[PDB]
Amino acid sequence: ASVKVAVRVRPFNSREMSRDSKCIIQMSGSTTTIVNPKQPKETPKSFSFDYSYWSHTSPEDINYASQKQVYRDIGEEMLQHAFEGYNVCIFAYGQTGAGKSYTMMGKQEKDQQGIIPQLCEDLFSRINDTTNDNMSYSVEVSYMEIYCERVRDLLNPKNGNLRVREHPLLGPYVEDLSKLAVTSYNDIQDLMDSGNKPRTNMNETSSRSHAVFNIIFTQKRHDAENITTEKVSKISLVDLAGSENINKSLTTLGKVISALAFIPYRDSVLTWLLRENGNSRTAMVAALSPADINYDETLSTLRYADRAKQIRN
């Protein structure tokens, strides 16, 4: 069906506290409100979404949205539809340091694993609990980075510009991008890390880079009668670029993001590549900063998140 949209507000960072910023994001129910610091007179505009996560405070707080809480709703839902044979897409949208990479990948400790790891772990959990001998599964994963229209394989750095292609009958694809068959959450977890630090001004991870991690979940159902049925699902869990080198992919997105449900799909590697996410079940988690000093940026995203929700594949 349509596209579920979720938003999140993180705690203050070092920069926000160093400027003594104030919280300008409020949330109650599924509705999030935002206040204008440089115009405290204007009416705080409120937006409503499928999820308005409050994670400003801390895991000590009761009304804090733990990453386990955000997975269970969105993630644990997409896996369900993946299993249902459907194509899924979860992409973190936001400002640099807004909380995308923490929402998606997160941290390896304190039960701080983002959406991605939780989906993986849950995928294999759901798989080894399989009693029906008539079932066999296949799980091949990829993990690339799109830094300014160029595609870079995070799992095979031992090489690349990697061209994005368009199969005459099988849509776009990054040729020579590796796909690695895994047989456990451990094997698919290593690929993550080794692929993580891989990612290509500012310090650490380039603000302007998209990191797509895709899983081709393949299910095989046999039966003595007498053919084995096969239904495959493609799982795209993305980590978009800071919504602000060129990374006009994200800007090109805004255009594609609009006109929900022509469309300049080929104006950017990202928009073209995730063309189907089309026939797919997509989720968008917008990462928001509680900082007043982010008035515009934070508002922008919201407006973006409000439009995306208006989509429906």
Ligand SMILES: Nc1ncnc2c1ncn2[C@@H]1O[C@H](COP(=O)(O)OP(=O)(O)O)[C@@H](O)[C@H]1O
């Ligand atoms: N929900 C959250 N809970 C706790 N800390 C968060 C949360 N979201 C962001 N942060 C903090 O902010 C930092 C950066 O957020 P990050 O996910 O890296 O942003 P981005 O992907 O946009 O660059 C992390 O080091 C993390 O501690």
